[PDB]
Enzyme design. Structure first.
Site, short mmCIF file in Angstrom:
data_model
loop_
_atom_site.label_atom_id
_atom_site.label_comp_id
_atom_site.label_asym_id
_atom_site.label_seq_id
_atom_site.Cartn_x
_atom_site.Cartn_y
_atom_site.Cartn_z
N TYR A 71 -33.19 -83.08 -17.67
CA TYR A 71 -31.91 -82.38 -17.60
C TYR A 71 -31.73 -81.69 -16.25
O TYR A 71 -32.50 -80.80 -15.89
CB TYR A 71 -31.86 -81.34 -18.73
CG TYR A 71 -30.53 -80.67 -18.92
CD1 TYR A 71 -29.56 -81.22 -19.76
CD2 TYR A 71 -30.23 -79.49 -18.25
CE1 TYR A 71 -28.30 -80.60 -19.91
CE2 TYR A 71 -28.99 -78.87 -18.38
CZ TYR A 71 -28.04 -79.42 -19.21
OH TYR A 71 -26.83 -78.77 -19.34
N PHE B 60 -21.28 -79.63 -14.93
CA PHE B 60 -22.12 -80.40 -14.04
C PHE B 60 -23.43 -80.65 -14.75
O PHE B 60 -24.17 -79.71 -15.04
CB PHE B 60 -22.37 -79.68 -12.74
CG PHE B 60 -23.25 -80.46 -11.77
CD1 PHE B 60 -24.59 -80.72 -12.06
CD2 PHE B 60 -22.73 -80.94 -10.56
CE1 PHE B 60 -25.40 -81.44 -11.18
CE2 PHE B 60 -23.52 -81.66 -9.67
CZ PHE B 60 -24.86 -81.91 -9.98
N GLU B 61 -23.69 -81.93 -15.05
CA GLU B 61 -24.93 -82.37 -15.68
C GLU B 61 -25.32 -83.75 -15.19
O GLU B 61 -24.49 -84.65 -15.08
CB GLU B 61 -24.83 -82.50 -17.20
CG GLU B 61 -24.68 -81.22 -17.95
CD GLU B 61 -24.66 -81.41 -19.46
OE1 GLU B 61 -24.23 -82.47 -19.97
OE2 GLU B 61 -25.06 -80.46 -20.15
N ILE B 62 -26.60 -83.91 -14.89
CA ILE B 62 -27.13 -85.22 -14.53
C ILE B 62 -28.35 -85.25 -15.45
O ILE B 62 -29.33 -84.53 -15.20
CB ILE B 62 -27.59 -85.32 -13.08
CG1 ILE B 62 -26.38 -85.18 -12.14
CG2 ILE B 62 -28.26 -86.68 -12.85
CD1 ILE B 62 -26.75 -84.99 -10.69
#
Ligand SMILES: *[C@@H]1O[C@H](CO)[C@@H](O[C@@H]2O[C@H](CO)[C@@H](O[C@@H]3O[C@H](CO[C@H]4O[C@H](CO[C@H]5O[C@H](CO)[C@@H](O)[C@H](O)[C@@H]5O)[C@@H](O)[C@H](O[C@H]5O[C@H](CO)[C@@H](O)[C@H](O)[C@@H]5O)[C@@H]4O)[C@@H](O)[C@H](O[C@H]4O[C@H](CO)[C@@H](O)[C@H](O)[C@@H]4O[C@H]4O[C@H](CO)[C@@H](O)[C@H](O)[C@@H]4O)[C@@H]3O)[C@H](O)[C@H]2NC(C)=O)[C@H](O)[C@H]1NC(C)=O
Ligand SMILES: *[C@@H]1O[C@H](CO)[C@@H](O[C@H]2O[C@H](CO)[C@@H](O)[C@H](O)[C@H]2NC(C)=O)[C@H](O)[C@H]1NC(C)=O
Ligand SMILES: [Cl-]
Ligand SMILES: [Cl-]
Lengths: 337, 335
Positions: free
Chosen positions: B164, B221-223
Site C-alpha cells: 500500500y 492518492f493510492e498506488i
C-alpha cells in the site's frame, strides 16, 4: 453619522481608488506566481489596478523580481507593523500555548501560532496598513487560486456605480469548534451598540432563529472585493476591538472570514452585499463556477459547472439567496444529491 | 493456514493500471489530471487506464479521454448492485440522517457521496475491468503531479514488495465515523488471526487500540496491490462494515476504511509513503522536501506548503510509527 455615512462618499463617476491586496510568505512564491497569471490573464491586462503585497517578514529579492515581472500594472511591497502581528498585553500566552498544543491534531491550523496572527491581521489591521490608506477599494487574492473565466468589465468601477460595499464568491459553514464564543461576543456587542445594527441587515443569512444562535454561515474571505471604508467605520473598529479584547483569536481560532461576515451582514443594509455569480473562482478546495450558460460560454470559463459549491449543502448559497430574495437557478437542488 | 500475505506474495512488467471513478460533469477537471499524469510519468512508463462511472459515459467524454491518454484506455459502468442501498439498510432512517446532517459537515446531506465511499471501500477492486491486474494507481479529477517521476512506480512496488503506497495523510472529522473504530475493534476481537503481529496500529492509535486517533491515508492518492482488498481478511472486514450500516447511517469514507485495514492486517513494512512524489488534491499538497529529489524531478510546488508534517496531517504519526527519521526541519511546519 451612521456606518453608511463613512462609505457613501466613495460612491463621482471617476476611476475608483482601488488595489489588489495579498498577504503572503516567501515560501509561497510558486503558488503566488500562479495566482498572478490568472489575475493578469483574466482581468488585470484589461482593467489595470495597482497590486499591494504584504508580509510579516521582509520579501526576498528573488520574490520581488519575480512578482514585478509577472504583474503588468504597478506593484507595491510592504511589511506589516510588529504591533499588528504580536500578542496584545492582555493575552495569556501560556494559556494560548496550551490551547494550540491541545488542538494541534483537533482541527486545521489548530496548533498553529502564526495562523492566528494571520486571522487577527486580516480581521483588524490589513485595512489600515499605510499602503492601503490612499484606496477606497481592495480585491484580496491568495496564492494557489484560479480565475476560471474572463472578466470583461472593471469590477471596482462596477461596485462604485452600483453602490455595493462587500462582494464575494464562495460561502460556507464554519467549524464551530473553531469559534465557540464568537456569536455570543458578537450579540453582546450589538445589544450594547444597538445603533450599529442596520434595520435592513442580513441577519437571516447568519441565523435561522432570529439571532438566538449562529447557523455558522459566512462569506469565504480568501475572495473579497470590498470597500475599505466599512472596516474603517466606527462600528467595525469597535467590533474588532471588542473581539480582540475577548481573546478568541488566540484562545480559540477565530477566522477573519466569519468575523468579516458577521460585521458585513449586521452593520450594513443587506443590499450593499453582492454575490459575484459570474466570476469563476477556485481556492482549494472550493469552486464558484458560473451556472448561467451565456455567462459561462461568453467568458470562456474553464471550470466544471457541476462542481460549483454555491448550492451544495455545506455551502451557504441557499441561505444567502433566500435571505436576499434572489431567485435560485432552476436546477439548484441537483447540487444537493 | 494461509495468511493474508500468502494471497499477495505471488504477485511479487507488473499487471497494473490507473483507475478513476468519475462523473460526466467533471470532464475538464479529469482532462487536467490526465495532462499531469501524461506529462509526469505515463508517456515514459505507459500503463492502461481504467475509467469507471455509475452512469454511462458521454461520447464527448470518451472521445476527449481517449485522445488525451497516450496508453490504452478502458471505460466501464458500475454494476447496479455496487451502487444502491443494500436490502438491509433502512432508507427512511438514512434519509432522515442526511436531511439532518446536510449543513453539519461536508457531504452530510449527500446520497451519492455515500454510495461513492461504499464503492471505493468494497467494490472498485472487483470491477470486471480490474480482474486482470494485481496493482492500481487511483487518480482523481482536479489533481496535480508537481514533479516528473523517473521510474516505473508499479515495478518499484513489486521489486520492493510493498502493498500500500500513499502520499497525503490526515485526521478524519470524527462526526462522520462515530462508531467505525468500535466496529473495527470488535471485528479484530472476533478475528484475531487477521491482526498482523507486526502491524501499524501505532499510526491509528496512541493508546494501543482503545481509541482511534483519527489518522488515515488520504485515499484520493493510492498506488497499491489489489490482492490486499481481495484477501479474506478484507472481504470479511468490509462485509462487517457493510452490515453495520455506517456508510449510510453515519458517513464512513473509504479513506479511513482502507487505512484501518492496511494498518492492522499487514506487516508495517508493507506500507510505503512516497516522500518523492509531488501531488496536490484540493486542498492538500505533498511536496518533496529532499533537495536533490525536488531539483532532479523539476518539481513545481512550494516545499513550505508540504502538508506531511503540519499538525492536522498524520505524517508525524506515520513516521514515528514506522521508525522513520523525520526531516530535520519538520517542526517548522507546525509554526
Ligand atoms: C495563564 O494561563 C495559565 C495556563 O492555563 C494559568 O495557569 C494555570 O492555572 C490553572 C488555574 O486556573 C491551574 O489549574 C490547576 O491545575 C491543577 C493541576 O495542574 C497540573 O495539570 C495541569 C493540566 O494538565 C493538562 O494539560 C497539560 C497541558 O495542557 C497536559 O500536558 C496534561 O496531560 C493535562 O491534559 C498542568 O498544566 C499543570 O502543569 C504545570 O505544573 C507541572 C508541575 O505539577 C509542571 O511540570 C508543568 O510544566 C506546569 O508548570 C499540572 O501538571 C489542578 O489540580 C487544579 O485543580 C484544583 O482546583 C480546581 C478549582 O480551582 C478544582 O476544579 C479541582 O478539582 C482541583 O481542586 C481539588 O483540590 C483542591 C485543593 O486540595 C481542593 O480544595 C478541591 O476540593 C479539589 O479536591 C487546577 O485546575 C493550572 O495548573 C495552571 N497551569 C500552569 C502551567 O501554571 C495561569 O494562571 C494564567 N495566568 C494568569 C495571570 O491568569
Ligand atoms: C426505519 O427508520 C424509520 C425512521 O427512523 C423508523 O420509523 C419510525 O421511527 C420512530 C420509531 O423508532 C418513530 O418516529 C416512528 O415510529 C417512525 N417514524 C417514521 C419514519 O415514520 C422505522 O421504524 C425504521 N424501520 C425499522 C424496520 O426499523
Ligand atoms: Cl494544521
Ligand atoms: Cl455538502
Amino acid at each position: 453619522k451612521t456606518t453608511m455615512d463613512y462609505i457613501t462618499p466613495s460612491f463621482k463617476a471617476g476611476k475608483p481608488k482601488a488595489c489588489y491586496v495579498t498577504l503572503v510568505r516567501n515560501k509561497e512564491l510558486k503558488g503566488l506566481l500562479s495566482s498572478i497569471k490568472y489575475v493578469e490573464n483574466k482581468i488585470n491586462k484589461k482593467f489595470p489596478y495597482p497590486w499591494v503585497f504584504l508580509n510579516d517578514e521582509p520579501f526576498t529579492e528573488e520574490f520581488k523580481e519575480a512578482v514585478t515581472k509577472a504583474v503588468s500594472s504597478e506593484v507595491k511591497f510592504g511589511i506589516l507593523p510588529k504591533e499588528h502581528w504580536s500578542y496584545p498585553e492582555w493575552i495569556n500566552q501560556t494559556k494560548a500555548a496550551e490551547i494550540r498544543a491541545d488542538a494541534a491534531t483537533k482541527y486545521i491550523y489548530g496548533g498553529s501560532e502564526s495562523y492566528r496572527h494571520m486571522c487577527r491581521y486580516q480581521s483588524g489591521f490589513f485595512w489600515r496598513h499605510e499602503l492601503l490608506e490612499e484606496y477606497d477599494w481592495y480585491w484580496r487574492v491568495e496564492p494557489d487560486i484560479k480565475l476560471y473565466c474572463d472578466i470583461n468589465y472593471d469590477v471596482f468601477k462596477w461596485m462604485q456605480e452600483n453602490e455595493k460595499v462587500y462582494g464575494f464568491t464562495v460561502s460556507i459553514h464554519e467549524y464551530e469548534v473553531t469559534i465557540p464564543t464568537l456569536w455570543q461576543t458578537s450579540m453582546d456587542f450589538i445589544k450594547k451598540n444597538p445603533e450599529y445594527l442596520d434595520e435592513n441587515n442580513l441577519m437571516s443569512f447568519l441565523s435561522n432563529d432570529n439571532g438566538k444562535t449562529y447557523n455558522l454561515c459566512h462569506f469565504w474571505s480568501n475572495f473579497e472585493i470590498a470597500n475599505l471604508n466599512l472596516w474603517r467605520s466606527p462600528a467595525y473598529r469597535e467590533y474588532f476591538d471588542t473581539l480582540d479584547h475577548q481573546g478568541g483569536f488566540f484562545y480559540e481560532r477565530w477566522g477573519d472570514a466569519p468575523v468579516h461576515s458577521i460585521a458585513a451582514a449586521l452593520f450594513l443594509p443587506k443590499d450593499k452585499i453582492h454575490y459575484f455569480s459570474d466570476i469563476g473562482y477556485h481556492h482549494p478546495p472550493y469552486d464558484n463556477c458560473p451556472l448561467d450558460k451565456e455567462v459561462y460560454n461568453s467568458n470562456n470559463c474553464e471550470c466544471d459547472q457541476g462542481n460549483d459549491f454555491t448550492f451544495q449543502g455545506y455551502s451557504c448559497g441557499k441561505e444567502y439567496y433566500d435571505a436576499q430574495g434572489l431567485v435560485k437557478p432552476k436546477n439548484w437542488k441537483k447540487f444537493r444529491e
